[PDB]
Amino acid sequence: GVPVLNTPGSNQFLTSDDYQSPSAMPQFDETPEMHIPGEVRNLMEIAEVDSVVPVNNVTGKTKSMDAYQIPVGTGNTDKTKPIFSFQMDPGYSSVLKRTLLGEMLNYYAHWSGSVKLTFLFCGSAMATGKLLISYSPPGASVPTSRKDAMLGTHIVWDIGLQSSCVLCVPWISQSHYRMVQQDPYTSAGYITCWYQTNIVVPPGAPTSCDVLCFASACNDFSVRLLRDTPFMAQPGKL
Amino acid sequence: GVPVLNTPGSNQFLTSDDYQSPSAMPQFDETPEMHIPGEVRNLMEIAEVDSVVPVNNVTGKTKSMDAYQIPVGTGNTDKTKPIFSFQMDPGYSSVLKRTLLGEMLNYYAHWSGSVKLTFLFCGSAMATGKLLISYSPPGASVPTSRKDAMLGTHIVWDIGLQSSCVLCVPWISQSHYRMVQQDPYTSAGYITCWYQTNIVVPPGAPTSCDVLCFASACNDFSVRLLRDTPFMAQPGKL
Amino acid sequence: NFYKDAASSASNRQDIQQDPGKFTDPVKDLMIKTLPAL
Amino acid sequence: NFYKDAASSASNRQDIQQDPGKFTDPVKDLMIKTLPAL
Amino acid sequence: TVANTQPSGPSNSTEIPALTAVETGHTSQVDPSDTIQTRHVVNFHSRSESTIENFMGRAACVFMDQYKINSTDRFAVWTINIREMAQLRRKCEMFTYMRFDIEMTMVITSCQDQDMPVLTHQIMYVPPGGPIPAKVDGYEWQTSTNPSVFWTEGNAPPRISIPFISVGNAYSSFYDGWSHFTQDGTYGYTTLNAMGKLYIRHVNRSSPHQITSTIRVYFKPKHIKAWVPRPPRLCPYINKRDVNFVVTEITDSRTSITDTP
Amino acid sequence: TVANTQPSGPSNSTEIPALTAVETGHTSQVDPSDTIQTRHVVNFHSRSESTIENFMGRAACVFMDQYKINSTDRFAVWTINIREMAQLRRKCEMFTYMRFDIEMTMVITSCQDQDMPVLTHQIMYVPPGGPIPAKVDGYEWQTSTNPSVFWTEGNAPPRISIPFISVGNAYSSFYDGWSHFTQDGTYGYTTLNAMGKLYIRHVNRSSPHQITSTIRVYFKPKHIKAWVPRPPRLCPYINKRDVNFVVTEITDSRTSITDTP
Amino acid sequence: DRVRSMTLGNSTITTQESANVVVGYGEWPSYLSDREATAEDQPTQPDVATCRFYTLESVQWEKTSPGWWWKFPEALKNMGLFGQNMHYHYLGRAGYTIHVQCNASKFHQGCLLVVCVPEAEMGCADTDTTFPATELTTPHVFTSDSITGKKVQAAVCNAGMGVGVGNLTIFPHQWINLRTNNSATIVIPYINSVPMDNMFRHYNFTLMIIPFAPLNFTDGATAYVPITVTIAPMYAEYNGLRLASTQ
Amino acid sequence: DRVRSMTLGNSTITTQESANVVVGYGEWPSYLSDREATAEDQPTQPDVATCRFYTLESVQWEKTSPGWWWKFPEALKNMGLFGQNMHYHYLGRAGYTIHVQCNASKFHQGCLLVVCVPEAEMGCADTDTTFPATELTTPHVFTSDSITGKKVQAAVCNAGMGVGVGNLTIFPHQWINLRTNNSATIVIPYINSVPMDNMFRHYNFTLMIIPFAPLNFTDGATAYVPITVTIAPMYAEYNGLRLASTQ
Ligand SMILES: CCCCCCCCCCCCCCCC(=O)O
Ligand SMILES: CCCCCCCCCCCCCCCC(=O)O
Ligand SMILES: Nc1nc2[nH]cnc2c(=O)[nH]1
Ligand SMILES: Nc1nc2[nH]cnc2c(=O)[nH]1
């Protein structure tokens, strides 16, 4: 018949291909389509949803509930010390690699866009305060004082009726994408929190409160290169 | 010539495929088409035809004619006991797996639609009666009294000149299809028969009559997933 | 159709026809669902 | 499309749709970015 | 698609859809819309996979036999019939008359009981009355007008299409009749089964060791027209040239008429 | 493409984009254009590879088992489920309900534990309730209405397409419910998993030496619709018929809340 | 619509309690058309000499009688001119109005299945031999047991052809329920894979009468309840004149 | 926009410090349409007898209480006519306005996660067995430890279904922050792979209430701070009448 020429790549099985294949069950009558609530068509729909961030994942608090809550107190000591501090890259950072942002990000090799950190204050209604949450791009060390941390993209968050604040990490990068894995060339900055003034509490209210942290993606967030997740780590037959 | 690429699935033999193949006998003059009466174009044409249901398939009556006839008598005893009772699913039920509905249904894995049970009364012309044939969807046990059975989709059938009645099982299912094999997730209900009043017979007529049962599909009946029948069970070379 | 012969063709699975009236009700006198049978 | 069956077809990778409004803000009363939440 | 269910309400009238007479040879055309109260539901269910073309249109095994390389066991012969194997027989013995043209697919697997070079097979079909070979160097094998397929191993299975080669307007699965006009001789469908023998051999002249090939023929009916449906077979398939049977129970038994699991 | 970043300037007003309330179940829709001063940048970045069709549309291994030539270890059986292997399970246990039709690709590699002639394999699929073979000369293997693939070695892997064969409007990865109506019997998604067994054997009758073939099935979902997203699995996959787990740390630990590398 | 009359070729049939006639597969029989014919010879069409009602020998229906079967066209040989045109012609068609009639009182009960099965290829009693032609063709009776020998396997559950006897409802059939009707009329068009066929060596259909509900009556009612079969070919035509065959 | 009222079938709900109601996945529940239905029987729609607020047993919230879960629809059995229509019908839908309410002072602190998880398939405490149905369904409590036995693994970090408990924010949920609101209302449309499903053997969703920030207060404040769940089905309809099931 028509003369054909077999090129390289014939009779192979590439797993990520787009070919038509003969149906095993011809003229099959599928079940009629029904409207189920909550259809997800893109995984960046479910990476842009908030998720509580285990910031206090110190040794002995991870397999508990105390990993999520950030201890914030009222006192005279250690008000020139950070409240927390962690890497901003949501893939390898030991704080936000497990969030919904970090779970959907570890199936990918490259990522772009702005992430935002939402801080819910879980104190009493009478306890008021102000906090400085700052982001500093890489190139220098971690900010060790509040003076060095207020030079980065920060926010002074007054705690009142609203009781929640969003720090949008503004995607200051050299390149268009960053590696999800940890490499020096594309490493995100640092997210530190500081006491702007203090937490002030009335005589009868509990003096030890805690901030609850969130993290999600913005509308310009995208992931770029599919890979397998390292978390599952199957040992053998189930 | 034209560069081609051999995809997976080449040089295989899928049994249920739709390909063109070279004719072994080219320019063959087939025998002219003739009109033979009774052309069947769909197997649900011949599953919607009635067929006598061996309801009385007790041990010792199956390899006989007494399997088809349902004993209905005139007496004072056992009028609060069912006349018959069986599973409604026509694939695995030991009563209607062999009917024409069940023979064409066992070539398939899924089935949908309403089945209907037709009851022919084979008594004398002077003997009259009333019967309650009920269908109860699953979720509860088998109805043990006529009070519990008249809560399902039932019919009170007066026996007279017409002498035949159709109980349409109305397809009350959770899903669009049910499994022909017996699984708990998609199991049909129960079909029980009861004495509404009694069978009343004149002095000279025979006091022991019997009801003859039928079963067929409705117009909304369909089968969905082709498989092999388990009945044939070839042992070896013929 | 890459062959001239008609037997050397794909199976016409697409068409769906049916006439169950020649099996379920082959009777001469028409029987109405509503009316009594006799 | 070289096959009649719809399951025997290429993956529709090209289409890109999304409705993140049913997950991020599923609230009844509309919440403006500018205004306070309560 | 199948018929939708029309909505009905409570009815009290002199019309009786449930009341029927089976003795009229008539199957009642009633729906659940006639007996009980129903809602309007739109049935998008189709009967596309219950048609005769989809039901019969799957390749079923019809013949297995061995033939050895390096006598009469050197090649195979089948004298074509559907009745060799039980599962496709029960589908074809479900219609009295049926008109179809089939393509056959062979699955030829050689097995060693010293290295086979490569095996090439010949599947020669002689129409009825043709010369039959009695040897592998028969002289019959040259196929001047017999259709024949040459196949070397390691390739796709040999598929060729066959027309409707029956003398009559349809193949007959059943023939309640005799062979001779005096009502004598062969009884049943064997008389009508005049389709030629099928001869399979290795075109390799010999082999250093004993190689036994087995062939598997897979008929798949297409362009199918079936007439006069009949009930499926209940009892098994003792013979190939006759519908003979041992009597079997019609259905699986229960302990009581009320007894149910 | 993704949304561009609009230019903003210094702002001093009674509007507060940063101030939110998480307790409203509401994720703030703010951008970096609301918190800080930004330049106008045109984002040509797309979300084309994060879609469900691109994410799930890669062929993942779902089944490996051996079957030998020359008993019940002569053929393989799988009773189809996604739960055999952990990596595709975590992608499918990420959505509660998901509706897709899959094509399966087999990778069949025979290995010797005297020369194999050539190996031809049969992958027969019985839908649920069909006859199961208990032997290689079962009689079940002839596939009158079961789908089946015949494959001889040295060719392209056998790829065939499968439709959406579920009873329900979607496959359910999770079923928080029981099998029986009395809340008894089998718990979990096992009750819903009614997809037939998959039978693989050598159609070669025998072999002079012991040959052990292994099969690798690769499902690739396509035409994918997914509903009700749920968080990815944290703890490992102890069983196949149930989501049972040993409790594990939520995240890797640090030494202090301020401690950072 | 219970009274009915059938008049064919000087022989009429009167019934007053009957179901309506059942037309086999919805086709009424007719003569062979010019486009579906195969024999270029002028066919013999004796419409009134052969297409008329022929009454077979009646059979006694008892409490334990299993059933009966006739094999047509052959059963109609040496009966009138319909059997004479078989012996002189090689080909033949017909359309067989089958009128099975069984009357009773209102104090008798029972239910017959009058079913016409095309190509009821029977089965031998011993599974490894073949049985003579006198076994197939006083109609042969079924048995409520298992026979052995050089005979047709005439068990009732497997109706002779090896199927479920309750599944014989797929064929054109009626029921004689003694409370409703006392007759069953089935019209059978010419059903065969061939336009004309020989009437001796080939049995186009068999008539099976099987009591699903057996006959029952108390003392005093008439014990002799006979079943009479009245078969009338329709649109019968013949081709291939020759010397008479001796059978 | 903090005050709100919900009136269903003669039962209204008043709240004065609350977030706005969260509609699960942006779909408000409704009756089953004619094109997406599967059962051709007229469904029972008792809109005022069943679609009303039912108040479950309140639970005490302590400084060390891990959490609670209910399993609906089943938790609403034998409660009003919504539970009676379960026992007599085989199928069912609803839309479950869930109003979780927990009040405190301005001197109490704490933060609950009120999350509705569809198909919260739990995990057994011992990884090789199966646990009875009384384990799943006084709401079952989580534990801030690891239990062992024939029980559901009710650790809090793995919320029972074996995920990160901070990642339960993907589901329709609210927070009860005691400084902001004292109630959380979630509306859940009928979420299932099937148009109607049985309400006994199948748990469409579970209601998990998990304190991320624990309850804390000094001496003098009220120690007994209860959490009350007020669930009201919406657009509930039933199909498949039968005898009452004994469960
Ligand atoms: C190498 C050439 C091969 C040609 C093989 C020709 C096959 C003949 C056609 C098959 C016979 C089908 C008979 C069916 C009869 C029935 O349905 O009972
Ligand atoms: C040789 C023929 C092969 C045919 C194989 C049929 C495969 C059945 C379909 C795969 C089942 C998919 C189940 C997914 C359920 C889930 O997502 O939890
Ligand atoms: N008398 C009569 N002639 C026909 N010709 C075609 N159909 C019929 C029929 O039903 N009755
Ligand atoms: N009352 C009310 N009815 C609806 N119907 C559709 N959406 C809505 C809603 O949000 N509120």
Residue numbers in the entry:
A (entry chain C), B (entry chain C): 1 to 238
C (entry chain D), D (entry chain D): 31 to 68
E (entry chain A), F (entry chain A): 7 to 76, 81 to 123, 130 to 277
G (entry chain B), H (entry chain B): 11 to 147, 151 to 260
Paper excerpt:
Viruses from the family Picornaviridae form non-enveloped icosahedral virions that are about 30 nm in diameter. The capsid proteins VP1, VP2, VP3, and VP4 originating from a single polyprotein form a protomer, the basic building block of the icosahedral capsid.
The electron density of the genomes is distributed uniformly in echovirus 18 virions at neutral pH, but transforms to a grainy appearance in activated particles at acidic pH. The inter-pentamer contacts of 11,000 Å2 in native echovirus 18 virion are reduced to 5400 Å2 in the activated particles. Correspondingly, the interaction between two pentamers in an activated particle of echovirus 18 is 25% weaker than that in a native virion. Comparing the cryo-EM images of native virions with activated particles of echovirus 18, as well as other enteroviruses, reveals that their genomic RNAs undergo conformational changes upon exposure to acidic pH.
